Write a protein that binds this ligand. Structure first.
Ligand code: SF4
Lengths: 99, 63, 315, 142, 51, 90, 55, 106, 15, 53, 51, 346
């Protein structure tokens, strides 16, 4: 589909946020999001960081991934099947195409 | 397979290489030297031409 | 109309680096069983231009900490020399008949990496500086052996002019004569170009995209592009220099038809190397060179100095 | 005519104007790069091509790189650009006005091939010299 | 390695071989001192040969 | 003497004055010295190209060698001085 | 399958094919089929020196 | 010189179409240097190593040597090779010798 | 040129 | 016994061994070859310069 | 280091540093005299092998 | 290890012998150049935080000197197309060859590096620096005495003597003083050089013999700072009682050998008329003498108070005798009624 995982945000755009987020971790996340070039996107993934998901009630989680970055598409799952993810990103393209 | 076979094939490739390269290189040396006779035959009248042409330009510019 | 000849040298090659990228993901894909890019093509073919457009369209930030002048001038030099090295290359007829253009290939190749040094210096980042530095280490460390073995394979063609190097291969090919030097030339081209096992400049997982990081959109496209320029170019260079071919002057085109094969046959191999070996680490990368390649390069060098006298076979 | 060799000499001299002024060694390294390519071009114009490519290779392709190492060992935070001090920039202008006042005012092949057969002595002393220079580098760093 | 002439590979002439040759043939037993007097003219023509 | 030579000589004079104005960390001085070296090289080679004084075609490269050689030495001393301070001439 | 790589690679070849042709014929186009002339040495240039004026 | 100019102007053209095109919003912290997320502990300073120059200098003194190796192909055709040949070997021996000396003084 | 010592002037080609 | 540690070095540092091998052999061999006398002789034969009468 | 172990005065070479504290230092008369006395001993006039 | 140290020192000897042999200029500049590389490391033995910047001084000045020299050679070639030594043919070049050599000798006002560098190294490397390094540049000056521009030479030749004086009255630690002694004698060598080289070479031989005498003595006592020298009168009285004499021979008190240089020099220059210059020169040489005398007062003539700790050291004979020494004393002193033999130098 042409998408290719390349490290270092400056050479990348869309961002996947797989897996549970935590408190200490969050500021680094905001850093990385800020250092991306426009037109940056992100993608919340799983029940993980859509809103804490399983770990919704703990002192160290930061509920949704939404509360630190402006998410685009959500891909609910726990884990989402990789294919449901694939439908996710294709849906992302069907959202860029409307840009 | 066997290690001796490796060196054997390699070194044989080398010597065949040196051999053919020797033949061809010598032959090209011959056609070269013949080309040097060619130019060496051409030369003198060019010497004459450049001669007269120089004295010509020198005269003209002097005038 | 020499200008249109030059333009005719520069456009097709850029097209070639683009499609080189695509081939890279293709073959390197099929080594992995997985198919490479495909969906956008139909055979992927349209991809690289979509890629480049994605880059140049994308915002290329000027970093707050970076000095700007070096930061901009480096990519320029990268594509510059990456293209300029192409000029004196006999295909069959060189665009320029340099009396000693091989040595010039070394000159361009040697100013190449300096751009890397600036690329990592002005980038200001920690990863930038460390990666750039180790990069320059491996590079120079390979240019010495590089130039020596190239010398030793050039004692026998006759002279530094390139076209003659065709003439000296009207039969056997150089490679059968001195393949071990061809090995070392190959690997030195495999490291000088900063490729697969000798992977360090990009660093990758070792240093998250190395020196190249802080560059964003366009300049990144320039270093990327120039890198592939050097890869195909050293490949072509090896091709003409170690693999001769029949050449009828009346039909030059025939020769070229052969030549792009013989060089492409090399470039693919780098990709088929990339799919195969883990990278060396900066110690061993220089260890094998200074300890192991080099002494053979010397012994082979005296040997090749000495054949023409013993064989009475002076070019 | 074109005076192209001469204008190359001019760019050369300003290459030393920005170079001899002393604004962090790295930019001076740029100064010798510019002056380097200009140099090889100038000597190329008389057709001693092999030499111009020696300097364009052996010098610039060698030296200024190793200087691109010394600065890694020296640097210091906030290196100065040419514009970053009154004496440095003052110096650069000081060169420009002078040089501007001035403006207001093959044989080689066998020639160097001779080095081996016909000039063994120099080869001896250069060999010996470089060798013991390596020894000196040892006896300093160790 | 000394001198403009003095046998050079493939007998390539110096650009100013002649004035030099004359000027040196002028120079022997005269030795250094008187030589800067008497041989001056030859050296002069050699100078203009050089520059 | 043709103006070009005068220009290179002047580049030497600047390549010296720069060495002697001599300021802050000394690495600049090894640069300025190498620049000086390069000017002498070029000024030599233009001459040997001029009169076809062929044997001397060997000198410039040999010149270059030792000259580069000493500079190659020079950095090493700087290392040592850099080793105890983080260099400055001051 | 793997053969499907080919559309990707052939496009390479033709691109690289172009300069090799494009220069070689431009020479003949300019030189009138004389297939260019190298002049590595002063002498050969002296032959092109004697020439042009002769025509 | 013509091809040099067309190449450099080409590249510079790519630069200018690279910057003056996306036409969007640069701002602080976006422009802050990358450091794998968390902010840098300090601007780049002194990654000192003797192990840099201890070899890199040796590079420089080999490169000077190969500079002398270059005349060789042409020197090979000299009229008197026995006068030459020793030297042709000689430098290489010293090259090797130099290396050898380094090889084992650690 | 009056500086230091005379610079003969004109174009480079002449020599 | 000196032959024995050749087995050792050949077991240990083969690259270097081959290096000394051809590296020395290239020095000793050439004097042996008769062709060498021809080899210099060929370069007497070819005349870049004109043969003045 | 082995060279330093031999020729012991060297290991002693800095132990007679001149700093001139009143308790250590001695006026010239007493020293000239006492050393004049040291020579009086049978084994000290000359190097040991010669005496 | 000695096996490498000796190769360095021998390649220094070679690096000077080469200057003394070759006629071609390029081999001379090679002679100095090889000399340099082989001179720096030997200054770096033992290695001190101090010694390092000593070598930095030395290298930095020698490098720039060699640079100016090569430039002036190239200019000479440009205006005469030669490489043989002989006369130079362009005064603007010639003055620079004189300058470059003026740094290489350390003559004033180029001199400032020499007192400092001497401070930074041990008396072995020191002695060798003040003797062997003085050969080569003189070895070329004798060859270009024919065309020297005497004004330029006598000015540095004098100023070397004044600076070699005034900077000598001021210091305590001996090495810096030895530096000003040598920097002063070089004025006397390079003074007479335009007029008659054989007198130069004579004076050179005496100077080398002398400074060999001193540095062998300082080695023998391991004295350095003046006070450190002061103690030695009680331990091994002889050698202080001999430093007195060799110092006086530096001073050129007339029975002594060191008078032979000056008194031939005064002769030669006097044939040239030039009568005033030697008078000023000879008068200042006195000023040079005076700190040799004060240094004599610290040492042998008077007894500075001994330290107690010295007593144990009395039991222990000095070792590692330096064979060449006694002759270096004696030749540098008693030889005066053997001046005429100087004509052996023709
Ligand atoms: S999604 Fe399933 S796996 Fe991913 S974090 Fe939430 S719980 Fe763990």
């Amino acid at each position: 589909f042409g998408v290719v995982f390349r490290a270092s945000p400056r050479q990348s755009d869309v961002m996947i946020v797989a897996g549970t987020l935590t408190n200490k971790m969050a500021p680094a996340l905001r850093k990385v999001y800020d250092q991306m070039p426009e037109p940056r996107y992100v993608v919340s993934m799983g029940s993980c960081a859509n809103g804490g998901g399983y770990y919704h009630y703990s002192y160290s989680v930061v509920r949704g991934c939404d509360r630190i970055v402006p998410v685009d598409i959500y891909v609910p799952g726990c884990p989402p099947t990789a294919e449901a993810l694939l439908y996710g990103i294709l849906q992302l393209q069907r959202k860029i195409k409307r840009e | 397979l066997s290690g001796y076979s490796m060196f054997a094939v390699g070194i044989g490739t080398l010597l065949f290489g040196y051999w053919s390269m020797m033949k061809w290189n010598r032959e090209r040396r011959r056609l070269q030297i013949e080309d040097f006779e060619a130019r060496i035959a051409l030369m003198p009248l060019f010497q004459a031409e450049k001669d007269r042409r120089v004295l010509q330009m020198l005269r003209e510019n002097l005038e | 109309m020499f200008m249109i000849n030059i333009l005719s040298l520069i456009i097709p090659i850029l097209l070639a680096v683009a499609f080189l990228t695509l081939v890279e993901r293709k073959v390197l894909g099929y080594m992995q069983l997985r198919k490479g890019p495909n969906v956008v093509g139909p055979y992927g073919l349209l991809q690289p231009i979509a890629d480049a457009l994605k880059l140049f369209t994308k915002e290329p930030l000027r970093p707050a900490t970076s000095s700007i002048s070096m930061f901009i001038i480096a990519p320029i030099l990268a594509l510059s020399l990456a293209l300029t090295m192409w000029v004196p290359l006999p295909m069959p007829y060189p665009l320029i008949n340099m009396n000693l253009g091989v040595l010039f290939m070394l000159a361009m190749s040697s100013l190449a990496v300096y751009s890397i040094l600036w690329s990592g210096w002005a980038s200001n980042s920690k990863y930038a500086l460390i990666g750039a530095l180790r990069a320059v280490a491996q590079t120079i460390s390979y240019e010495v052996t590089l130039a020596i073995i190239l010398l030793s394979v050039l004692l026998m063609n006759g002279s530094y002019t390139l076209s003659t190097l065709i003439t000296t291969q009207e039969h056997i090919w150089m490679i059968f004569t001195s393949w071990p030097l061809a090995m070392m030339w190959f690997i030195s081209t495999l490291a000088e170009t900063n490729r697969a096992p000798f992977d360090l400049t990009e660093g990758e997982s070792e240093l998250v995209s190395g020196f190249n990081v802080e560059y964003a959109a366009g300049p990144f496209a320039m270093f990327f592009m120039a890198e592939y320029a050097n890869i195909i170019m050293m490949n072509a260079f090896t091709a003409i220099l170690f693999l001769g071919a029949s050449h009828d002057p009346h039909t030059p085109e025939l020769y070229t038809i052969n030549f792009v094969l013989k060089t492409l046959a090399l470039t693919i191999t780098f990709l088929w190397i990339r799919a195969s070996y883990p990278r060396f680490r900066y110690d061993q990368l220089m260890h094998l060179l200074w300890k192991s390649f080099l002494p053979l390069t010397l012994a082979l060098c005296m040997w090749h100095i000495s054949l023409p006298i013993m064989t009475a076979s002076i070019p | 005519t074109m005076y192209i060799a001469f204008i190359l000499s001019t760019i050369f001299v300003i290459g030393f104007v920005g170079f001899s002024s002393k604004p962090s060694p790295i930019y001076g390294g740029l100064g010798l790069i510019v002056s380097g390519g200009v140099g090889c071009g100038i000597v190329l114009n008389f057709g001693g091509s092999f030499l111009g490519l020696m300097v364009f290779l052996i010098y610039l392709g060698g030296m200024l790189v190793v200087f691109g190492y010394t600065t890694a060992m020296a640097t210091e935070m906030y290196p100065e650009v040419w514009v970053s001090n009154k004496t440095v920039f003052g110096a650069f202008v000081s060169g420009l006005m002078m040089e501007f006042c001035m403006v207001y005012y093959s044989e080689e092949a066998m020639g160097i091939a001779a080095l081996y057969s016909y000039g063994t002595w120099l080869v001896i002393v250069t060999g010996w010299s470089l060798l013991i220079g390596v020894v000196v580098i040892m006896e300093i760093t160790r | 390695m000394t001198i403009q002439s003095a046998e050079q590979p493939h007998k390539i002439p110096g650009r100013c071989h002649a004035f030099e040759k004359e000027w040196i043939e002028c120079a022997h037993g005269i030795g250094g001192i008187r030589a800067e007097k008497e041989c001056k003219i030859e050296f002069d023509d050699f100078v203009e040969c050089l520059l | 003497m043709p103006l070009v030579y005068m220009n290179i000589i002047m580049a030497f004079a600047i390549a010296l004055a720069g060495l002697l104005m001599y300021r802050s960390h000394l690495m600049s001085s090894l640069l300025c010295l190498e620049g000086m070296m390069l000017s002498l090289f070029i000024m030599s080679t233009l001459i040997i190209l001029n009169t076809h004084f062929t044997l001397a075609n060997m000198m410039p490269i040999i010149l270059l060698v030792f000259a580069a050689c000493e500079a190659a030495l020079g950095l090493s001393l700087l290392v040592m001085v850099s080793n105890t301070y983080g260099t400055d001439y001051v | 399958m793997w053969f499907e790589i080919l559309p990707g690679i052939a496009v390479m070849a033709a691109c690289l094919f172009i300069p090799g042709m494009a220069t070689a014929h431009i020479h003949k186009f300019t030189n009138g089929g004389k297939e260019k002339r190298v002049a590595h040495f002063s002498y050969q240039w002296n032959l092109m020196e004697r020439d042009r004026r002769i025509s | 010189m013509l091809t040099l100019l067309t190449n450099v102007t080409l590249a510079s053209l790519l630069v200018l179409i690279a910057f003056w095109l996306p036409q969007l919003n640069a701002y602080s912290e976006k422009t802050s240097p990358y450091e794998c997320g968390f902010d840098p502990m300090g601007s780049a300073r002194l990654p000192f190593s003797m192990k840099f120059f201890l070899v890199a200098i040796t590079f420089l003194l080999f490169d000077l040597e190969i500079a002398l190796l270059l005349p060789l192909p042409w020197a090979s055709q000299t009229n008197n090779l026995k006068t030459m040949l020793t030297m042709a070997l000689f430098l290489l021996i010293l090259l090797a010798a130099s290396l050898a000396y380094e090889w084992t003084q650690k | 040129v009056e500086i230091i010592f005379k610079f003969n002037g004109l174009g480079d080609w002449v020599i | 016994r000196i032959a024995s540690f050749l087995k050792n070095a050949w077991a240990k540092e083969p690259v270097l061994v081959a290096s000394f091998a051809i590296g020395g052999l290239a020095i000793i061999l050439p004097s042996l070859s008769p062709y060498t006398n021809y080899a210099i002789r060929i370069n007497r034969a070819t005349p870049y310069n004109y043969p003045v009468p | 280091l082995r060279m330093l172990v031999q020729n012991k005065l060297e290991v002693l070479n800095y132990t007679t540093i001149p700093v001139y504290l009143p308790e250590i230092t001695i006026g010239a008369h007493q020293s000239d005299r006492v050393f004049q006395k040291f020579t009086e001993l049978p084994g000290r006039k000359y190097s040991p092998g010669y005496n | 290890n000695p096996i490498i140290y000796t190769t360095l020192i021998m390649t220094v000897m070679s690096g000077t012998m080469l200057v003394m042999i070759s006629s071609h200029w390029l081999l001379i500049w090679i002679g100095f150049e090889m000399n340099l590389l082989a001179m720096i490391p030997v200054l770096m033995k033992n290695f001190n935080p101090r010694a390092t910047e000593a070598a930095t001084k030395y290298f930095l000045t020698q490098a720039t000197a060699s640079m100016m020299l090569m430039m002036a050679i190239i200019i000479n070639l440009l205006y005469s197309g030669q490489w043989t030594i002989t006369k130079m043919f362009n005064p603007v070049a010639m003055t620079m060859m004189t300058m470059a050599l003026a740094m290489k000798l350390g003559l004033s006002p180029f001199h400032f590096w020499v007192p400092e560098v001497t401070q930074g190294i041990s008396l072995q490397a020191g002695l060798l620096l003040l003797t062997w390094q003085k050969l080569a540049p003189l070895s070329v000056l004798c060859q270009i005495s024919q065309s020297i521009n005497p004004n330029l030479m006598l000015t540095m030749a004098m100023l070397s003597i004044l600076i070699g004086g005034w900077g000598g009255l001021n210091q305590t630690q001996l090495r810096k003083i030895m530096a000003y002694s040598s920097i002063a004698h070089m004025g006397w060598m390079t003074a007479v050089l335009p007029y008659n080289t054989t007198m130069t070479i004579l004076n050179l031989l005496i100077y080398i013999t002398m400074t060999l005498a001193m540095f062998m003595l300082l080695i023998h006592s391991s004295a350095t700072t003046t006070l450190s020298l002061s103690h030695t009168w009680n331990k091994m009285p002889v050698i202080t009682s001999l430093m007195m004499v060799t110092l006086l021979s530096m001073g050129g008190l007339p029975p002594l050998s060191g008078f032979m240089p000056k008194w031939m020099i005064i002769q030669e220059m006097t044939k040239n008329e030039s009568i005033i210059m030697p008078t000023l020169m000879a008068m200042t040489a006195l000023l040079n003498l005076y700190f040799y005398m004060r240094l004599a007062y610290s040492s042998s003539l008077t007894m500075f108070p001994s330290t107690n700790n010295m007593k144990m050291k009395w039991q222990f004979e000095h070792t590692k005798q330096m064979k060449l020494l006694p002759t270096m004393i004696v030749l540098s002193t008693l030889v005066l009624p053997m001046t005429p033999a100087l004509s052996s130098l023709n």
